[PDB]
Amino acid sequence: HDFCLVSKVVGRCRASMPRWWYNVTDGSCQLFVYGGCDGNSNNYLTKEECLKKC
Amino acid sequence: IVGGYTCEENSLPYQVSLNSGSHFCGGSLISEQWVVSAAHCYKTRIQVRLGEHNIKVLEGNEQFINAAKIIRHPKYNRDTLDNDIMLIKLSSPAVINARVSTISLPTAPPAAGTECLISGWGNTLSFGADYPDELKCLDAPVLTQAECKASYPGKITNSMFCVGFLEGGKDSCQRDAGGPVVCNGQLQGVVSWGHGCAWKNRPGVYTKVYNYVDWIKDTIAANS
Ligand SMILES: *[C@@H]1O[C@H](CO)[C@@H](O)[C@H](O)[C@H]1NC(C)=O
Numbered sequence A: 001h002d003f004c005l006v007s008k009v010v011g012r013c014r015a016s017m018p019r020w021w022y023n024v025t026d027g028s029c030q031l032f033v034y035g036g037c038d039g040n041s042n043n044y045l046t047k048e049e050c051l052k053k054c
Numbered sequence B: 001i002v003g004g005y006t007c008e009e010n011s012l013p014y015q016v017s018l019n020s021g022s023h024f025c026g027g028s029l030i031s032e033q034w035v036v037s038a039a040h041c042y043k044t045r046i047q048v049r050l051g052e053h054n055i056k057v058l059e060g061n062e063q064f065i066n067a068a069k070i071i072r073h074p075k076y077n078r079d080t081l082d083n084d085i086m087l088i089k090l091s092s093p094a095v096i097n098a099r100v101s102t103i104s105l106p107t108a109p110p111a112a113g114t115e116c117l118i119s120g121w122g123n124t125l126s127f128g129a130d131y132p133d134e135l136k137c138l139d140a141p142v143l144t145q146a147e148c149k150a151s152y153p154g155k156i157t158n159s160m161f162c163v164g165f166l167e168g169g170k171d172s173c174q175r176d177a178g179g180p181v182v183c184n185g186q187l188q189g190v191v192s193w194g195h196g197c198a199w200k201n202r203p204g205v206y207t208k209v210y211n212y213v214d215w216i217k218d219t220i221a222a223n224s
């Protein structure tokens, strides 16, 4: 759930780190901009990593 | 930068871009071999990009130099963002010219109402995303510490101050972190965090560089 069924969170930090998240609606992993802090566990360094979990 | 303007192309020779996989943070050149940025921008493999106005076109003044040492503040806390500052030593010195040059460290603390210049290649939208090729600038005043704490109750530490506007619309944003807040010709701030970007009553929160002048000078001296 925490890893696969929560929506993407940028968080308060202001970096732009490209991360992957699983979108249930789409059935796939998609890239988003992560701010660098906080956020949630639906947040992977690669597409491969994301699909494997989700 | 949301609600700003395109910077003049020769006017920010101290602005740098940190690149690892993507353009992910900004920074400021403070000596020939050293850059100041945010501790939350830490990565082990960084290329520092100097002399840029447009991050997608070669203008002729670019110097892209690997980071040899990357030193987060020794009391950085990732959960509170306390002491969100870092130093990068370049693998080779930058060559100082009209388009690549240093920004002065501050010789007085920043005061409320002082006018500053915030810059970066961050998101320009509060609605969705538009990451610009050309460097953006925002003219913004330092806010009172009382306004800062009222905007972010219990979250403002001794390392932090707010710069910008309580009305929404004008702020730094994602990809701007690490970049410069310059006031009276000196580096006073490092872009750090905020709740959203340019939202009502949620100004940007910045690391107060004046608190680390001794740490910066000592770190440079110890790693020479
Ligand atoms: C999830 O995927 C759907 C279908 O591709 C897309 O419409 C939607 O915008 C995605 N959600 C988010 C939050 O990006």
Ligand SMILES: [Ca+2]
Binding pocket: B051, B052, B053, B054, B055, B056, B057, B058, B059, B062
């Ligand atoms: Ca360029």
